[PDB]
Amino acid sequence: GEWEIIDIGPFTQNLGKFAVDEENKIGYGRLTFNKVIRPCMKKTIQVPAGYEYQLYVYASDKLFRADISEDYKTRGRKLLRFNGPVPPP
Amino acid sequence: GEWEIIDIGPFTQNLGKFAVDEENKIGQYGRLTFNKVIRPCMKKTIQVPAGYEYQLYVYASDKLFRADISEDYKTRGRKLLRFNGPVPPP
Ligand SMILES: [Mg+2]
Ligand SMILES: [Mg+2]
Ligand SMILES: [Mg+2]
Ligand SMILES: [Mg+2]
Numbered sequence: 085g086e087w088e089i090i091d092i093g094p095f096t097q098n099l100g101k102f103a104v105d106e107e108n109k110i111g112y113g114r115l116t117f118n119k120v121i122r123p124c125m126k127k128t129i130q131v132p133a134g135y136e137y138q139l140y141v142y143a144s145d146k147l148f149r150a151d152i153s154e155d156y157k158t159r160g161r162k163l164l165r166f167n168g169p170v171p172p173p
Numbered sequence: 174g175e176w177e178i179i180d181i182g183p184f185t186q187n188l189g190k191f192a193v194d195e196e197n198k199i200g201q202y203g204r205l206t207f208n209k210v211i212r213p214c215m216k217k218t219i220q221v222p223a224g225y226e227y228q229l230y231v232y233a234s235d236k237l238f239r240a241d242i243s244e245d246y247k248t249r250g251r252k253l254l255r256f257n258g259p260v261p262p263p
Binding site for chain 2: 085090096099100102103104106107110112113115116117118119120121122123124125126127128129130131132133134135136137138139140141142143144145147148150152161162163166172173
């Protein structure tokens with residue numbers, strides 16, 4: 085995951101209100117919400133929608149660049165690019 | 174996107190064979206004979222958000238707490254993950 089700083093506007097204040105409400109159903113005693121202060125951090129949970137492979141392919145005595153897509157669920161493969169010749173990496 | 178090197182071997186060789194088979198069905202380069210995939214070979218993960226986690230400094234009852242909230246990416250369903258405190262101000 086990747087992280088980012090977000091400001092403390094009304095959206096962020098409502099997240100704090102949610103936390104205090106949920107925490108009351110556990111019961112630190114009964115807490116009264118005040119405010120969210122900085123910093124506030126947002127972590128994005130990323131999941132694969134698919135993949136791309138980027139290859140250096142030697143074919144017929146030539147170095148080519150090929151890109152292949154792969155669907156994450158079906159794992160279906162498609163040829164995206166096939167350019168060359170290119171210089172060796 | 175997230176990137177990765179993967180080592181070569183029969184897996185990448187079949188990716189190379191697939192590349193040449195598919196390009197041969199187009200045939201602008203003529204009929205190509207696959208030889209090998211060399212290093213480096215890159216795997217790009219095309220990513221979509223599954224959800225978020227928020228890390229908050231919340232004052233409640235004049236006490237500073239530390240709270241963690243998960244939020245679903247599609248439905249925005251929220252859950253309280255953690256709530257420890259009090260903590261010192263940052
Ligand atoms: Mg391999
Ligand atoms: Mg292998
Ligand atoms: Mg072929
Ligand atoms: Mg205060």
